[PDB]
């Protein structure tokens, strides 16, 4: 009937977290990136981001209808109060979740870690990304497991800006031999408007407005025909 506001917000966060985990374990092969809920009067619209949408809807939305049915019958919303959409993401080649899933599904079928891993690092770099770091840890065969990491560009670690400039995705890829952990960190580039980069710049970068060339005569003398 009614629960305290702290409990209400904690439960809403739990709703978001478990929904995110549920459709992460559902459609990671669909290039899922993230899920966002929208506050609407007495309704809860949910919009879901995936690299591919024709697959997530499929034919006549069998997958979409299955997902909405299971979410409705799991979460206890009133009949037909939960509806999930599917819209593409403008930032696909530098989103940590998308590239982590790409690495996992290039590494699952059996492939040299380095070729696919450098390929995804490239596809990150030509997507305008400012810097990337990928680490693959686990069995490189033998009695010892190792970690190999490839970095490119500039990427920061410490301070506040790592919160809103670097996104990191940690995933497990299950090989018939073992489990390989992939950690993919990307720093977005600064670009105001469009929501493609963080609004604020790096807080140690001082920008200066550039004057233009000025080669002028001694005195401005009016000229008429």
């Amino acid at each position: 009937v009614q629960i305290s506001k702290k409990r209400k917000f904690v439960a809403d966060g739990i709703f978001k977290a478990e929904l995110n985990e549920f459709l992460t374990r559902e459609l990671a092969e669909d290039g899922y990136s993230g899920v966002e809920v929208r506050v609407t009067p007495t309704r809860t619209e949910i919009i879901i981001l995936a690299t591919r949408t024709q697959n997530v809807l499929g034919e006549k939305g069998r997958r979409i209808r299955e997902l909405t049915a299971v979410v409705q019958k799991r979460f206890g919303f009133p009949e037909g109060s939960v509806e999930l959409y599917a819209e593409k993401v403008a930032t696909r080649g530098l989103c940590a979740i998308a590239q982590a899933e790409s690495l996992r599904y290039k590494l699952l079928g059996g492939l040299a870690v380095r070729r696919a891993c450098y390929g995804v690092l490239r596809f990150i770099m030509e997507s305008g990304a400012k810097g990337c770091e990928v680490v693959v840890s686990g069995k490189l065969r033998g009695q010892r497991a190792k970690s190999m990491k490839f970095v490119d560009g500039l990427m920061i670690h410490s301070g506040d800006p790592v919160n809103y400039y670097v996104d990191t995705a940690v995933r497990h890829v299950l090989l018939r031999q073992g489990v390989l952990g992939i950690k993919v960190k990307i720093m977005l580039p600064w670009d105001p408007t469009g929501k493609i980069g963080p609004k604020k710049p790096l807080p140690d970068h001082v920008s200066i407005v550039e004057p233009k060339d000025e080669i002028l005569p001694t005195t401005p003398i009016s000229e008429q025909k």
Partner: peptide, 26 residues
């Protein structure tokens, strides 16, 4: 070629060291 590079750089001095280096270009 990539698989040989990975095997070599995993254990550059272990049991699978001479064979991988030979297999690289020979």
């Amino acid at each position: 070629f990539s698989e040989w590079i990975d095997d070599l750089e995993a254990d550059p001095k272990g049991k699978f060291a001479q064979n991988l280096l030979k297999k690289l270009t020979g």
